[PDB]
Every structure is written in structure tokens, then in C-alpha cells.
Amino acid sequence: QTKQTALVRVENVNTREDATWYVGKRVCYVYHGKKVKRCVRWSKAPARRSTTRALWGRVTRPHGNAGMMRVKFNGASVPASAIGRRIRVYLYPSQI
Amino acid sequence: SPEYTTLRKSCAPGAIAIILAGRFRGRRAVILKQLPHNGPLVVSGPMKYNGVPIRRIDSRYVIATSTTVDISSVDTASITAEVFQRPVSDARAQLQKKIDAALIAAIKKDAQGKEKAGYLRSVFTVKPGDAPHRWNW
Amino acid sequence: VKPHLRHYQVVGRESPSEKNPEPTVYKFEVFAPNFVVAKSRFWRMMRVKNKVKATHGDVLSCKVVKDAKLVARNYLVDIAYYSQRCGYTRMVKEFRDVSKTGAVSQAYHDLASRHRARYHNIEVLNVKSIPDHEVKHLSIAQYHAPNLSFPLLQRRLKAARKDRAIFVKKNTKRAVVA
Amino acid sequence: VKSHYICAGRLVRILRGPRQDRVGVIVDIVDANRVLVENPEDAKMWRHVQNLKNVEPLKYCVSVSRNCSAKALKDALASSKALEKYAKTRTAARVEAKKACAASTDFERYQLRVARRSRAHWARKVFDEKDAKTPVSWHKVALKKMQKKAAKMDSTEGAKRRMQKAIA
Amino acid sequence: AFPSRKDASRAQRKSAKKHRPEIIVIDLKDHVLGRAAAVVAKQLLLGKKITVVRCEQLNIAGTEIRNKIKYLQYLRKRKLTNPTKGPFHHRAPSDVFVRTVRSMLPRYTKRGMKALNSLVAYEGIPPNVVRTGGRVVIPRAQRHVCYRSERPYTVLGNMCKHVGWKYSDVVANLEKARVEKASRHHEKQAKLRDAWKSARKEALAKMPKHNVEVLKKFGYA
RNA sequence: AUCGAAUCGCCACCUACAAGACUGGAGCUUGCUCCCUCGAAGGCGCCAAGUAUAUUCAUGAUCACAAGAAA
RNA sequence: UUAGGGAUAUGUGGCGUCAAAACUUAUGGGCUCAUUCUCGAUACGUGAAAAGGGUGUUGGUGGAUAAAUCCACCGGCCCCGAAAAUGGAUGACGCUUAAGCCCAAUUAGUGGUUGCCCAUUAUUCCUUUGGUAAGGGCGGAAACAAACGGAGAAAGUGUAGCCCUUCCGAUGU
RNA sequence: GGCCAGAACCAGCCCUACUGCAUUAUCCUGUCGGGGGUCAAAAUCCGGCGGGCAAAAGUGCAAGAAUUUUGGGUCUUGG
């Protein structure tokens, strides 16, 4: 396996034409750590301070032939501990 | 070089928008102007319906729905790039009241869906089994 | 879908020479997916039957011949093919179909299924649509009975490709996993 | 489920391909799998071979011989009024109504969303307007908690309830 | 109790509410064995929690004497020198299925045993799952689709009866037992279901009339 | 009590059964016609307890794990 | 056919799960049921089978008697022929409206015209190193203090390479 | 701020959408003879004689400037 590009099955997207709509969207992987580390709005909005974390990426292109769409997690790869768990595909940047 | 738009033509002033990110998620809101350079749009809802104040929202974080309003009765020119400079202020406080109160009527002048008011009071959730990628907007 | 074999008319001759000026310009019908496959199977019959070879020959034109408007017809296709068991059996069969190509390309699929012969060992001797009363085989003789009607039994209904829905809730159409 | 048949003319709708929900008239029969179908009233549903896997016959049959000249077909659809019969069919209601769900502008999906609450809000009142008949597990077991006033309306709670409410 | 006293003590110390994860429950009557197991195996690698149910009624293609022999050829294979370590042979149909799945999973990696451990099979429909939600089905694994009706087939529970799965009668008596208890309760509800089904058409009348034209458009009327 | 958590659809209408050479009901002529509820829909949820006259929201300052947690 | 990396595309081989690709593609045609080494299913790989048989089924050729039937012969798949020593192998599970065999196609008589996945390959971009390497600059143009646009510029095989632009190659007992 | 994020614009590169020239006749469509079937016709089918453009075909080639006020991608390049 080449660990740069993930593969994501996003629910209720079952065909290739349905994947090209998502090229460019920003995926997220919302795992958590143990101790609470630094965070994007730290001390601006201290109520976000918590154990949860996220890794971000973008949807590079449809993989497969039915609803399957590759991903680039920017500058790195996702853990292999993420396989089979929840990835988040947002609706932005909107092309509409 | 002074003022021009590369903004998509499908996002005009007056188009109802669905805000995809930020403190206001899924609250629908009214696209009002584009700032002088390629700017963030200034969306406005009569805060009275949604709760969305006058804010900056760039093109890519929002969806522009096909339903517009007639905004030609609202004065946009009173929103410049300066009003957002420092970082409840009276200068900002009553800049709502001269738009929201000016915009509400421009809603009530519609026909055929004279009330978008109900439509502006709502949220856009993606519920299980939506597939928003098949939808028209 | 549409047949996989186009219907070509290939016309060619030997290149003229002091020994044989004005060669005799043969015409030929092939069913082939390309016109190079039609142009190849033309120079096969030319050296096999006429002794003229492709390096000494000329091709006058390769154009396809278009098929008549679609109606249900009974086509009579007479085919040979090579085996090495039986050494060139020759066959005459009928096919229900709407066009010459659609019948002949259907005959290549049956020879390949029943007799396992693959397009290069096969050569079609002739094809024509025949009137109804000449259908010998009771299997194709049954489709021109008027008032012919049958239901559709033991079907398999594939939903729209967008609707496939791996897990569908029982006795309902609601898709739990799609 | 009704089987119907494949005869010279059933009306039939296509299941899948580029002509999807469009209806057509069976005309001829080509072997087992293949069938020709024309609907003159809808151009683009012209004379073409169709494959019976894609073709689901419905209950209306126009009367024509095999291989009609299509002016005999056009008049026979007229006289039969099959396409106007099928127009008020409850499925053809949806199939025409399904095309209108895909084309929704999200304001429309608001308009539907509004309705399906109204239809739901009144059906919650209309149903709840039957108190004279009570069958819901909240309202019915209350009816089962009734008649237990004996051990309640007797001397026990008679004083007890006059102690309790006074404290309130 | 199965839960430790502490995660009962913790759940009570943090209070909140009882929890159940989102779980799929697939009926399995007349689903082809090897097709239904593949589809399940690929949904277990995607992180789904699946409860298979009614494994007894799974089907296989071909005669019953034939598929008996296939399983008996599977009994013939044991470790000769120490069979207690020889390949194991499960009888009960719920076990036949979790094997047909398992051998289709990478069971020797921690994600292969993490997928398998999320599947739960059963005989019949146990009370643990009778009423939670609605049973789901796998339409590409179904028998009336996959098999020509002309071909003989088997019922997994009848095949496994004549190998060492002796619980067959105990299950048949629990299926006869529930399907009554359900259909007694089902027809009992027919008084209620018809009330609602009536209250929608009765509401469509006094509902505001510009909405009902929408329901007629988009089709729910 | 550490503990800050990844999860993001609820339901006392789905959560009964069966069939697929067939399951709305019927007639002879047995593939057609006629009748019905018209044979292709679990309900609900998606921001006023309800489609209409309303009503706090900002400064969390353009994205950031949803800064939210009993539908 | 292998310098160190990225992208796009492909070869041989593939798209039921293992396992990336048809979430088991088509709105493609046929044929096949195989009861204890368990029908079949990667060429090279007898890395397994023959002669001979079969009113199993599916085609064809020739002749013949007249409601259709009969005789001879030739194919296809399948079956019998077919017996070894540890439990065991289409790679495993399993598949039969094939996930098998022959043939064929690309979202399907609807408009022609590239379905999809994977290489240290091809194309291209960046970085290295070596050339039978190719070319340019190297006479300091002028101006210019701190305080409150900088710095180099070597006539050179090889260095922290005189500088720069370019082109091809790059694995190895 | 030499760190982390987004969003705009520029060159290059990649991708996708957008189509014309020829061609058709073993064809098109009348009609008259057959011929075929049916309760009776029509059709499939052969021939004659008229007319012609199936206006579209899975024919052969394709060059159609993607900021020439609007297609995408570049966290695969540099600004």
C-alpha cells in the first residue's frame, strides 16, 4: 500500500459521477489523544480546550467506479489506526 | 485592480445563502454585497429571523440558492471595508437597524412565496440518506 | 446491445501489370469489427481463392453497407467453420433478429457457444432474410404465430444504479446502507 | 403481483436505460429477449429495439397487429385512450412526481418540509381528538388505572388527599 | 452480572442515560450463504456492527445429500497427532456462518479479529433482538433472485441437523413460539394502525389548503 | 471521582408472517376484460406544537473537533 | 530493465470477500448440475489422464415415411472409464438468475468517441551525480558611510564545486 | 514572525465540457404483380415501375483559441 492517499467510502454516495462532485472538499478525522494539547483558538475560546483532535485533508479524486473517492491528508498520512472509522466530508469549498 | 469580481455569477446580491461554516451553521442568510477587491461577501439576515448579524463570508464557505429577493430597495453602499477594522458598538449596532429594518420590507414585497421569512428561519442539516450531491439548489 | 460486427463491402483487384492489365475487380462481403479486419479477410479470400496477394493487390473501397429499418425478421445464415476434429463442417441456421449484422453477429456467438469456434475459423457463406413459411425449425417457427403472448416469469429486477442499496429494510424500500 | 404478458401491444414502461421512466407500446416480438417499442405521442420513443429485461409490462393493451405502420398505432393509442388511462394511475402519479423531486430547488424542499409537518401536526390533533375511544399505551392504561378509585376514593385517601393539597 | 461492578458504578456515577450502539440486524431467511457472508464481510471491514439472525434458514445451492457430504469431507480433516489442536468443526448454523464469514476476513490481524468480533449470529430471533427496530435484508444475497427456482437447494438448518447440531428441534419450537406472540400482538395493533392511517386522510381535509397542493406535488397526497 | 473523548436518527404506526411460476377483489375467453383502496412509499424528525401577523441571537470579529449533548 | 522523490497514464494480470478495481457492470448471446481424492475455473506446468462408452442435455449433416415421426453419422458441455498410503487444498472461503465455460461490450439500436484497479515501466515536474558533455559571464558599467536593498564574481579536471543556462545517461557478480 | 491555517490573483502544467468535413442505394418511400397467411386483412418475402434526404447513422477523418469579463486540479510546480 502507498500510504499517501487514503480511500473513503462516504455514505449514500454510490456512483462515480457522484464522487466528482466532492473533488476538493475538506475531510477530517476526529480522533482523540490522552492529555489535552494545544488547540487552534486556544485561550481565545478556552471552551474548546479538550482531548479531542483532528487531522485534515482534501478529496483528490474518485477512486474506483462507485462512490469511492481518494483523499490527501495534508503533509502527512492518517494513522493506520483510523482504518474502518469515521471520516468527515464537509460541504466546503462550495463550487455552487 | 481597483474593484472587480471573479466571484461566480451564480452568487449575486440578493441570493439566499446557506452558511456552511462558522458560528452560524446551516442558518440560511441573505447575500448582500461583495467587498471592493475580491472580498468576503457581506451576508445579512435581519438577525431577527436567524440571529445572523452582518458578517463577512467568503464565496467558498457558502452555497448560493436559486431563490433571490429584490434588494434594490436596500442601500448597500453604507457597508464598506472600514466598518470591520478594530479586530455591541453603536457604529455597528444601528447599522443593523438601517439594513434589517430596510431588508425586512424588501422581503415583504415579494410574491409567490411572499414569505421567505419562514424559509429564512430554519437550519440546513444533512440528515441520514440525503446525498446533497444529487440536489439542485 | 448493437451487434459487434459491422457489415462491409470490400472491392479490390490485383495491381495492373504488363502480364494482366485490367484485372477483374472482385467484390466481397464481410462481417468484421474494423475495416482492417474486413480488409484483411478480403486479402485472405483473394490469395486463397484467386491467388492474388495483398502486396500485389489494390483495394478500391472498404465502405460499410447500412442495415434496413428494424423489423422482426427470420434470417438464414449458412456458416462453415474449422475444427481439426471434423475438418470443416458446414451449417445452415435461422435466427430471429432485426438486421443482417444483428443476425450474423448472433451466429458468431452461437458457434462460439455451442461449437466453440472463434471468428477466425468461421466464414459466413451467405445471409438473407427469408419469408415466414420457409422457417424449418420449430424453435424459430413459433415466433411468427400471431397472437403470440407470454408473461415475464422469474425475473431479476436491478434497481437504478443510483439506488442499489446494499441493506434494504425488510418488506420496505427504505435503504439502511446504500 | 399481476404478471400481464408480452403481446403485440402492451403499454409498457422502460426500467433503466437512457429512456427510463418513459412509457412505450410493444409492437413486434424479436425472439425471446428482444421487442420493438414505439410511443408516437412521445417523440424520442421512436421505433427501436428494446430488451425485455428492461421492460415492465403494465395493465393496458392497445389492439394492433404485429409490425404496425405507426399511423395505425397512433390512431389505436387515441381510440384506446390508454395513455390517458395510465395518466391517472397511482404509480404514474409518482413517476411523474419523482421527476419533480430531483428538480427541487431547496426552497421547494422547504415547501414540502412545511407541508409534511402540517399533515403531521393535524394528524396528531385529529388522532388525539379521539378521547372517546382510547387505545394508546399512555391513554389506555390510564383507562386501566381507572376504576381503581376503590382503594382511592374510600376513607384512606379521603383524609390523606385533604392533608396533602392543604400543604400545597 | 456481565458488566464489572465499576462500569456499573461508573455509569451510575456519571449518570447520563443507557446506551446502545447503532447496530444492523439482518434476518437471513433464504439468503444465499456465500453471497450473504461476503456482503457482511465487507461491511465488517468498514466498521459496522452487525447482528445476523435466523442462520438456520440460510440456503446453499444443490441437493441436501450433496451439501451434507461437503460438510462431512470437512469433518474428515483433523490434526492426526493431537486432534484437540486439530481443525475444529462447528455444527450449529450460526457457527457455520461466522466461519464462512471469518475465512473471508484477514482474521490473523488485529483488524481481522476486530471485524469478526463485531458480528453476532443467532438461531431464530432471540428476545435480545426481537423488538429493536426493523430487520434488514440483503437483496443481492436473496434466493428468489440468485437461484433459478428450477434448481434444488438446501436449508442450512436442515443440513446441519444430520451432523451434530442437535438443537434443531429446540429452535423450531422457539420460532413457532415467537411468531405467534408477534402475530397476536400484530393483529392486536390493527385497531391502532387503522386509526392513524385514517387520521392522515382526515387531517388532509382541515389542513391549510395551500400546503396540500404541495403534498399533491412531490406526491404524498 | 479521576473523566477532558472519538460516535452525531428518533419512534408504545418499522420493530409479525409468507410468497417471487407471485399476495388487492373477480369473470371465462386462460390472456384479456372489469371492479377497488388502482397494486412503486413504515411513520416521524430537518428550528413558532405549526404555516401565520410573531419573537432574544452580533464582538465567538472570513475556515478550524459542533465552543453544542435527552428529539 | 532499476539515481532520490511527486503527479498523471499504462503493461502482464485482474474487478464476490481475503484484496486495490463492476458497493456481485450492461438496459449482452448461448451452454453446464457433477453423492465422500467432494463438476469446473492462470498459459509455460503429465505441476495429470487415454482407448472406449452414455434414450444426460444442446447443436449440426445425410437419407426416409407422412401428425408429425424414424434411421445413420458428426460436434459442445457434462457423466462413466478414474485405485495409495499424516488432514488438506481452483491459493482459502465459497460460487450454480456463476463468483463456471465459449464469445462479446463499456454505462448501451440513444445519438461514438478512453468503465475501473495495480508496476523501480511510459510521459512530465523537482532534486542528485557523471559526461566524448553544449553554451554564456569573468577589462569589476556608473551610484551608493555609519546613526535614526544585502552579498559574491577564482581563465577554472578534482573542493564548501568560479558563476549561470541547457541536454543526455544513472541498476550489476 | 523563518510557525500553523484559509481565501483571492499570475505563469506553466494536467484534466474535463463544448463539433465540423465527407459518406450512405444490398437503403427510403410510393405503387402494381405475385406470395403468404387469417374469420377477414395487414406484415415478414421475391419481382416490375415511379420518386428520393431514413436526416439521421454506434460510417471515415476532425484542427472546435476553456477569463477571448467566467469549467475544474496543483498540500504534484513556482510566484
From Swiss-Prot, chain D:
Species classification: Eukaryota, Discoba, Euglenozoa, Kinetoplastea, Metakinetoplastina
Name by which UniProt lists this protein: Large ribosomal subunit protein eL14
Superkingdom per UniProt: Eukaryota
GO annotation (BP), single: ribosomal large subunit biogenesis
Organism of origin: Leishmania donovani
Keyword Thylakoid annotated: no
Region of interest (Disordered), ranges: 149-168
Gene3D superfamilies cross-referenced by the UniProt entry: 2.30.30.30
Compositional bias per record (Basic and acidic residues), positions renumbered to this chain: 151-160
